[PDB]
Structure formats: structure tokens, C-alpha cells
């Protein structure tokens, strides 16, 4: 797989090459290829780094290994009647996933905790992080970090179209609507 | 000084490995510059290459002791303990353990201030695939090109031995590559960056036709590997000699190969405007020099990759940046 | 204190997850994620990270999000230092560098003691999330609820439940902290 990368990068340098490595010491060889550029999204998905990392965070907070593992497998909620009370609540948790989408102009000049509250209370979307314009990736910052225009927000939600309610939100129009499916309106 | 019985090589008394052994502390302390770096890949169980044959011609009696380029081999101790039997009788030789993929090893060696970094692989050739053969040889060359120094990254001159000819394409990063195209036509070979074994298949034919043409180059390459040596080495006691008589030491005069840049010196006038034919005649009369060929820059309009031109025409224009291969009497 | 020892087992095979726990319904037809040992954080197969190749294409930043959240700030700065071959290095460092201790780690908050215990008795998850966010600077991601409630000590994950979801005093809540 290291040689597969070299052959691609030999043919053409400017290209995104994502690799699945197994051992962590082999990741050092990919980083020393001259064409391999971190900046343009060449991600060496090292399994041993992540595998043990997921486990390591469970030592700090048990069960976190399977909180995160479910966020990246793209699932959908199909509650069969054979399941019990505890399983149906778990299988809803499997259907949640990470998503990136831009916040609307309603969130501009507004603090993080108040913004994350509006996403949860009204829109029903858990807002984790906001990328701030070197684009720094700030996870759950305090009240000091404000929201600039066209900020990329990181959401835990059921689907991507559910997160698109953040993009179509309006303080003038949608502020009195209880049904959250009624926020499909791009017209604000 | 000490010399071989033949009067062809710089000899030494026999040593243990720990005299010439170094760590990263001791190697960096030694102010190494304008030298050779043998990046050697080998297991303990892997068979002998005979790095003796690499180091021997570097230690030719043509060169003075101060002029010798100090060689630093980088590999296993278990492997080099075998080859130390042959290598021990060569001055300015230094062994540093560990693999040469580690940048901590190369930065201690001062690979940025290297005349030629030779990459060799002693490991078993074709035991698995054709693509995974030169994994170490390619990754080492790419590692050195990628490095940057602060007192020179891609400007480190190196030469890579290869098992497969098709794997030559992965070395250099900026050229048109086809496995249909033979090894000799490729950009890495043409610039002296690669050297496959396959180019010496033709040497079996020349040894039949021109009996003397094979023994010509053994004088010109190995630096006077006389049959006298081969029978001494067959007797099994390694290299030997001492101080030797002035009749034997008068055999230091033979023609070595050398490059002459046309930037400074008296030959620089020809590089500006004149031709190769005008250079050859002037150099031959005054200095005793046969210009074989040129080592011209690929890009002229900027990477520092020069390519070979063996015996060009009489009317061939020169540049001030060119370098000329020459047989000297110095 | 025998079965109450919390442990997590790496596995080569997904089908071998069934042999870990002793009290559940087992079918090799059922996938690794649905099984009781995985759901409770007792197992972790490698197969669940096959999907991570797709997310790295679509969401370039979603992969580098979790590497901050998991490894605890494995910056590219480190990866190039480690590629240079001399291992980890540092020293005491300046106060500008040591101001980078503030990032959000993950943590559990039990709803038995403390100010949040009031919500565990009667109230819902939505009421907890809003109160915790304003005062403390906390995002409640999910719950780690007991399987049996009517007794083994096996808790299962619930990632981002609904607004109206009832809590118990025995629950534990996953949280991103600033402490
Ligand atoms: Ca879903
Ligand atoms: Ca190439
Ligand atoms: Ca079982």
C-alpha cells in the first residue's frame, strides 16, 4: 500500500491519496515521500492508531469506544418489534452520525453556547464544533469564541438533510414553528 | 605511508570493528564533508555483497591520503561483522549501526554535505513479488530527497542499485514513465541516479570479442585490480603489503577519471561561446587530458539533474555550467 | 467485585464477540454493532473502522476532529518530529506553548450526586442539556444507562437521545469538558 501510493504520486503529485495502514511505524514512510502533502487532505487512516485510541478513551470514560464507532458507520433507524426497551434506544444511537454543514446568517454575531442551544432546542441537532477562519477546529469553546460569517459547523444528527435545517434557519420566519420538518423552506 | 604489496591501494594494519564503530554522538562530532555514504540494507542472515569492491577503488593509490573521500557505511552490525574481515584494511572507513531510513542516522552523517550517497540492498532479491523488491531502495532515496536542512534537499547526489529495471520509474518524481521503455533510456539512469544490473549482460559478449576491453575497464574502474592481487587473495590471508620499494610506488601514476567544470580555470573561455572540439584539442596538448564526454544540465531556461553525453561531435556548443569527463595524469 | 471489573477486549473476528458475555441471545447473522457486548463497551472489533475510509473523503475535517478528541492533540507537528527518528522530545517549554492544555477532553458525569442530580429523579434529557451548557460549558453527547432496571452492572450507550427522553438517577452522561 505504501508502494501503491508512490506509484500514484510518481504519475501525478497534486492528488488526494487516502491510505489504510495497519501498523503505526509504517506511517512514517508515507510522511517522508516528497509529493505526499498533509495540506491537501492526504490522510493515512492508520488502524492501530485509532483502534487503540478508541479503546484508550474508554479507559477515561467507559463505553466511549462504541459511542464514536457508531457515529461513522452510516446507519438508519429500523426498529423491529422483536427488540426490547434497551435495544430500541441503542439502535436510535446507531443512526446518529457526524456531519459538516454551514450555519445560516441567523447564527452570525452570536456566542457558541447560545448557538448550540438553538441547534438542540429548536432544530434538534447536537452542535459539537465550529471551524474558525489556517482554519482552526475548535471543539466546544466557551462564550468568548463568536460565530463569524459562513462558519463550518460539526453536527451529530440522523441524516445530512436533517442538518440542512441549520442552513435554512431564519430568526424572522421560523421562530414560532414547533414542527421541525416545516423548516424545509429555503425562503426566509 | 602504508600500501598494498602491488602498490595499488592504501593499506592498513588489521583492526577490530570497535575501532571504526560510531554512534550518533561520535559521527556528528566528526566534521564530515565531501564524502561517501553507503546506505546499506541487510538482515543478519542475508548474503554478502562485498562492499570491499565499492570501497577498494575509492582507496586507489592515485589519490593522496588527504584527498581520499571518507566512507560511512550505515546498516546492521550482524551483517557488517562478516564483511569487516575484507573491509578492515581500508583507511577512513566508519561504520554506524541502524537502518538508513532513520533521519537521525543521516543527519549525524551530514548527508547534505555528501559527494555521493550510495544506496545498496543486500536482501534476498525475488522471493515474493516484483513490486516489493526495491521497497527499501526507493523509500531511502525518496526520504533523502524529501529532507530539508538548516546550516540542499533534492540537491543531495545519490545512486541507487536496483533488482528490477521497471522500478526505476519510482525514483524521480518529474518525468514521463513507460515500462515499455528500456532501462537505459529512462531519466534516472541517464542522469547517473540509477544503476541496474541488467546493463552488464552485454559484457559477456565483449569479453569474447575484445579480450583486452574487459581488462581495460578493470584498470580504469577498480583502480588497478591486477591478477597479482587475485592470486594473493585466493591464498586466503586477506590484503597485505607494508611500506614497499620506490620501484613499486612509482605505480601511482595511472589514469583515473575526473570531472572538470567549465566555470573557473583556463578552460572556462571555451564554455562561454566555443565548441567541444576546440576544448578537446587545447586540453590535450597542454595538460595531457582526453575529454570523454559531458555532464550537462537537463533544464536550461530549476532542478540540479545533469545527464551524460559520451563523445559528442566536433561542432557541439558548450555552456558555462557544463562538466567534462576526463582521464588525468595527476 | 468479580464480574464488576470493567474490561474491553480487542477482537480479530466479529463472530467471536458472542463468547464474551454469558447472558444474551446470540446469532452470527446479527452484525457486530447490534450485539450486547459491543453496545455496552465490553468489545471493540476492528471491522467498525471500515467506514472511516469513506468519511475521510467526504468530510476532510471529520477525521482530524476525532484525532484531536481521541489521541489528545496528535498534531501534524508531532508526526514530522517522530518521522525524523529521535522519538518524543521537549523539556519545560514556554507559557505560550503550555497555554495549549485547555482543549476539550471527554468525561462521564453520574447523575447521583452534585447539582445535576435533580434532573435524574424526574426530568428529561433536554432539560439537562440546556442547564449544563449555560452554567458549566458542557455538551451532553449521550447516556450510559443500566441494561437491567427492575442485577448485573452492564451499561449501554445512547448517543444523542431525543429532547423528551426520561432520565434515571443511576445514569451516566458523556460530556465534553473545559476542566
Ligand atoms: Ca442515520
Ligand atoms: Ca518517475
Ligand atoms: Ca454470549
Record the cell numbers describing residue B116, joined without a space. Answer: 555521493
Complete DSSP assignment for C123-163: -BHHHHHHHHHHHH--EEEEEEEES-------EEEEES--S
What distance in Å separates the CA atoms of residue A29 and residue B139, rounded to the nearest whole number?
7
B175 is in an annotated binding site: yes
Cell of A127: 452542535
Ligand 3: centre distance to CA C31 (Å): 14
C67 chain-A contacts, CB cut-off 8 A? 53
Rounded-to-integer distance, Cα B65 and Cα A176, Å: 92
How far apart (Å, rounded) are the C-alpha atoms in residues C20 and C7? 11
Task: Say how many CA atoms lie within 13 Å of B147 toward its Cβ.
Answer: 26
Rounded to whole angstroms, the Cα distance separating C42 from A148 reads: 42
Beta bridge pairs of residue C10: C44
Sort out which chain C residues have CB atoms less than 8 A from B107's CB and list them.
Answer: 84
Which chain A residues are within 8 Å of C173, Cβ to Cβ?
Answer: none
Residues pairing with A21 in the sheet? A46
Phi, psi of C41 (to 5 degrees): 75, 20
Asked if C105 and C139 count as a contact pair (C-beta separation under 8 A), the reply is no
Q: 10 Å Cβ neighbour count for A131?
A: 16
Distance, CA C13 to ligand 3 centroid (Å)? 15
Residue position matching grid coordinates 564483511? B83
Contact B279, B161 (CB under 8 A): no
Instruction: Centre a 10 Å sphere on the Cβ of residue C20 and count the other Cβ atoms it contains.
Output: 17
Per DSSP, the residues of chain A read -HHHHHHHHHH-SSS---EEESSSTTHHHHHTSSS--TTTT--EEEHHHHHHHHHHHHHHSTTHHHHHHHHHS-------TT--HHHHHHHHHHT-EEEEEE--GGGTT-BHHHHHHHHHHTS--EEEEEEE---EEEES--SSSB--TT-EEEEEES-HHHHHHHHT--TTTGGG---GGGTT----
Burial per residue of C127-157, b for 16 or more beta-carbon CB atoms within 10 angstroms, e otherwise: ebbbbbbeeebbbbbbbbbbbeeeeeebbbb
CA distance linking residue B99 with residue B119, whole number of Å: 12
At which residue does the C-alpha cell 518524481 appear? B173
CB atoms within 10 A of CB A24: 15
Cell, residue A180: 421541525
How does DSSP classify residue C166? Answer: B
Give the number of whichever ligand sits closest to the CA of residue C19: 3
Task: Show the cell assigned to B195.
Answer: 544503476
CA distance B158 to A77: 59
Displacement of CA A13 from its chain's centroid (Å): 28
B249 CA → ligand 3 middle, Å: 86
d(CA A47, CA C54): 14
Cα–Cα nearest to A10, from B255, B171, B199: B171
Identify how many contiguous H helices and E strands chain C contains and give both numbers: 7, 6
- Residue C109 CA to residue A110 CA, distance in Å, equals 28
How far are the Cα atoms of A107, C68, C82 from residue C134, in angstroms, in the given order?
17, 24, 40
Q: Which residue has the cell 545533469?
A: B306
Which three cell numbers mark A106? 441567523
Opening angle at CA B177, ends B176 and B183, nearest 5: 120
How far is the centre of ligand 3, averaged over its atoms, from the C-alpha of C48 (Å)? 20
* Nearest chain A alpha carbon to B134: A3
What resolution does the deposited structure have, in angstroms?
3.5
* Four-point Cα dihedral B89, B95, B100, B106, nearest 10: -110
Q: Residue B243 burial by CB count (10 A; 0-12/13-18/19+): exposed, middle or buried?
A: exposed
Q: Which of A68, A156, A73 is nearest to C53 (CA)?
A: A73
Look at the block and give the residue holding cell 470514560.
A61
* CA trace torsion B57, B59, B64, B70 (10° rounding): 120
Measured between beta carbons, which residues in chain A are less than 8 angstroms from residue C68? Answer: 137, 139
Return the partners of chain B (3 or more C-beta pairs < 8 Å): A, C
CB contact under 8 A, B104 and C84: yes
Beta-carbon contacts of A90 under 8 Å, excluding residues fewer than 6 positions away, are C39, C156, C157, C158
Contact B194, B159 (CB under 8 A): yes
C36 carries a ligand binding annotation = no
Q: Are β-strands A136-139 and B93-97 bridged in parallel, bridged antiparallel, or unpaired? A: unpaired
**A43 touches C62 (CB < 8 A):** no
The bound ligand whose nearest atom lies closest to the alpha carbon of B187 is 2
Written in H, E and C, the secondary structure of chain B is: CCEECCCCEECCCCCCHHHHECCHHHHHHCCCCCEEEEEEECCCCCCCCCCHHHHHHHCECCCCCCCCCCEEEEECHHHHHHHHHHHCCCCCEEEEECCCCCHHHHHHHCHHHEEEEEEEECCCCCCCCCCCCCHHHHHHHHHHHHCCCCCCCCCCCEEEEECCCHHHHHCCCCCCCCCCCCHHHCHHHHCCCEEECHHHCCHHHHHHHCHHHHHHHHHHHHCCCCHHHHHHHHCCCCCCEECCCHHHHHHHCCCCEEEEECCCCCCHHHHHCCEHHHHHHHHHHHHCCEEEEEEEECCCCCCCCEEEEECCCCCCECCCCCEEEEECCC
Q: Do the beta carbons of residue C157 and residue C144 sit within 8 Å?
A: yes
Contacts of A12 by beta carbon, 8 Å cutoff, 6+ apart: none
Residue in chain A closest to B143 (alpha carbons) equals A32
> What is the residue whose three cell numbers read 564533508?
B33
Q: Using only C-alpha atoms, what is the Rg of chain A? A: 20
Nearest to C174 among A18, A55, A61 (CB): A61
For residue A91, the CA-to-ligand 1 centroid distance in Å is 10
Q: How far is CA A103 from CA A108, A175, A188, in A?
A: 8, 16, 14
Give the pairing type, strands B306-310 and B290-297. Answer: antiparallel
| Residue B271, all three cell numbers | 564554455
What is the number of the ligand closest to the CA of A76?
1
Nearest to C128 by CA among C72, C97, C168: C168
Rounded to 5°, angle at Cα B160 from B159 and B163: 150
Residue B100 has a CB neighbour count (10 Å cut-off) of 26
Helices C125-136 and A112-121, axial angle in degrees (round to 10): 170
* Expt. technique: cryo-EM
Q: Is residue C176 helix, strand or coil?
A: strand
Torsions phi, psi of B214, nearest 5?
Answer: -75, -45
Query: Would you call C117 helix, strand, or coil by DSSP?
Result: helix
Smallest CA–CA distance, residue C82 to chain B, in Å, is 10
Rounded to the nearest 10 degrees, what angle do helices A85-94 and A64-72 cross at? 50
Name residue, grid cell 464480574: C3
Cα–Cα distances in Å, from B108 out to A28, A114, B26, B74? 19, 55, 8, 11
Q: Are the beta carbons of C84 and B105 separated by less than 8 Å?
A: no
> Which of B106, B134, B141, B146 should we substitute to test contact with A (largest number of A Cβ atoms within 10 Å)?
B146
Closest CA to B283 of B235, B234, B325: B325
**C147 grid coordinates:** 441494561
Choose the mutation target among B136, B142, B168 for the interface with A, i.e. most A CBs under 10 Å.
B142
Residue B149 CB contacts under 8 Å (≥ 6 apart), including other chains:
B107, B112
Contact by Cβ (8 Å): B89, B242: no
Whether the Cβ atoms of residue B86 and residue B238 lie closer than 8 Å to each other: yes
Cα A110 to middle of ligand 1, angstroms: 29
> What interhelical angle do A47-60 and A64-72 show, nearest 10?
140
Contacts of B147 in chain A (CB under 8 A): 32
Contact C141, A64 (CB under 8 A): no
Q: How far apart are CA A182 and CA B1, in angstroms?
A: 96
Say which of A72, A120, A121 has its CB closest to residue C51.
Answer: A72
Which residues of chain B are at the A interface, by a Cβ-Cβ cutoff of 8 Å?
101, 103, 131-132, 135, 138-139, 142-143, 145-147, 154, 169-170, 173, 177
| Ligand in nearest proximity to the CA of B186 | 2
Q: How many CA atoms lie within 13 A of B222 on its CB side?
A: 16
Cell numbers linked to B159: 545512486
C70 with A54: Cβ contact below 8 A: yes
Beta bridge partners of B260: B324
Of B124, B105, B140, B134, nearest in space to B32 by CA: B105
C-beta atoms of C83 and B102 within 8 A: no
Instruction: Tell me the CA–centroid distance for residue C43 and ligand 1, in Å.
Output: 22
Amino acid at each position: 500500500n505504501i508502494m501503491r501510493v508512490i506509484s500514484i504520486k510518481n504519475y501525478h503529485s497534486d492528488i488526494k491519496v487516502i491510505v489504510q495502514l495497519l501498523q503505526y511505524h509504517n506511517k512514517a514512510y508515507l510522511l517522508n515521500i516528497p509529493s505526499w502533502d498533509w495540506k491537501r487532505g492526504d490522510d493515512a487512516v492508520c488502524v492501530a492508531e485509532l483502534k487503540l485510541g478508541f479503546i484508550a478513551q474508554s479507559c477515561l470514560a467507559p463505553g466511549f469506544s462504541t459511542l464514536m464507532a457508531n457515529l461513522f458507520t452510516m446507519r438508519s433507524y429500523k426498529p423491529t418489534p422483536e427488540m426490547s426497551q434497551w435495544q430500541t434506544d441503542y439502535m436510535r444511537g446507531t443512526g446518529m452520525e457526524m456531519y459538516t454543514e454551514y450555519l445560516s446568517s441567523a447564527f452570525n454575531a452570536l456566542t457558541f453556547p447560545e448557538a448550540a442551544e438553538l441547534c438542540f432546542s429548536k432544530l434538534k441537532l447536537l452542535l459539537l464544533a465550529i471551524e474558525v477562519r489556517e482554519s482552526t477546529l475548535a471543539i466546544n469553546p466557551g462564550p468568548k469564541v463568536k460565530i463569524e460569517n459562513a462558519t463550518q459547523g460539526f453536527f451529530i444528527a440522523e441524516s445530512a438533510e436533517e442538518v440542512k435545517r441549520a442552513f435554512y434557519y431564519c430568526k424572522n420566519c421560523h421562530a414560532n414553528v414547533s414542527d421541525v420538518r416545516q423548516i424545509k423552506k429555503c425562503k426566509c | 605511508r602504508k600500501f598494498d604489496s602491488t602498490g595499488m591501494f592504501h593499506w592498513c594494519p588489521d583492526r577490530p570493528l570497535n575501532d571504526c564503530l560510531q554512534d550518533r554522538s561520535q559521527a556528528s562530532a566528526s566534521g564530515l564533508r565531501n564524502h561517501v555514504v553507503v546506505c546499506l540494507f541487510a538482515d543478519a542472515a542475508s548474503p554478502l555483497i562485498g562492499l570491499r569492491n565499492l570501497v577498494m577503488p575509492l582507496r586507489a593509490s592515485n589519490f593522496h591520503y588527504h584527498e581520499l573521500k571518507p566512507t560511512i557505511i550505515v546498516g546492521n552490525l550482524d551483517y557488517l561483522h562478516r564483511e569487516w574481515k575484507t573491509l578492515q584494511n581500508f583507511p577512513k572507513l566508519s561504520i554506524l549501526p541502524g537502518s538508513p531510513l532513520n533521519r537521525a542516522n543521516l543527519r549525524a552523517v551530514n548527508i547534505n554535505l555528501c559527494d555521493m550517497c550510495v544506496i545498496v540492498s543486500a536482501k534476498d532479491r525475488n522471493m515474493e513479488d516484483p513490486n516489493l523488491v526495491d521497497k527499501e531502495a526507493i523509500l531511502c532515496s525518496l526520504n533523502i530527497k524529501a529532507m530539508t536542512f538548516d546550516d540542499a534537499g533534492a540537491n543531495v547526489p545519490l545512486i541507487t542499485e536496483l533488482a528490477n529495471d521497471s522500478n526505476v520509474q519510482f525514483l524521480d518524481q518529474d518525468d514521463d514513465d513507460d515500462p515499455d521503455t528500456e532501462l537505459y533510456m529512462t531519466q534516472p539512469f541517464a542522469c547517473g541516479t540509477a544503476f541496474a544490473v541488467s546493463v552488464l549482460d552485454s559484457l559477456m559478449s565483449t569479453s569474447y570479442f575484445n579480450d583486452n576491453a574487459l581488462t581495460l575497464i578493470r584498470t580504469l574502474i577498480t583502480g588497478g585490480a591486477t591478477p597479482e592481487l587475485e592470486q594473493i587473495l585466493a591464498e586466503g590471508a586477506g590484503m597485505r603489503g607494508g611500506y614497499c620499494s620506490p620501484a613499486v610506488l612509482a605505480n601511482r601514476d595511472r589514469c583515473r577519471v575526473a570531472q572538470i567544470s567549465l566555470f573557473d580555470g583556463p578552460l572556462a573561455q571555451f564554455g562561454q561561446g566555443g565548441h567541444y572540439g576546440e576544448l578537446f584539442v587545447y586540453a590535450l596538448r597542454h595538460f595531457g587530458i582526453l575529454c570523454i564526454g559531458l555532464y550537462r544540465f537537463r533544464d536550461t531556461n530549476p532542478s540540479s539533474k545533469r545527464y551524460v553525453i559520451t563523445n559528442p561531435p566536433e561542432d557541439f556548443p558548450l555552456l558555462p555550467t557544463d562538466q567534462v569527463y576526463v582521464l588525468t595524469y595527476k
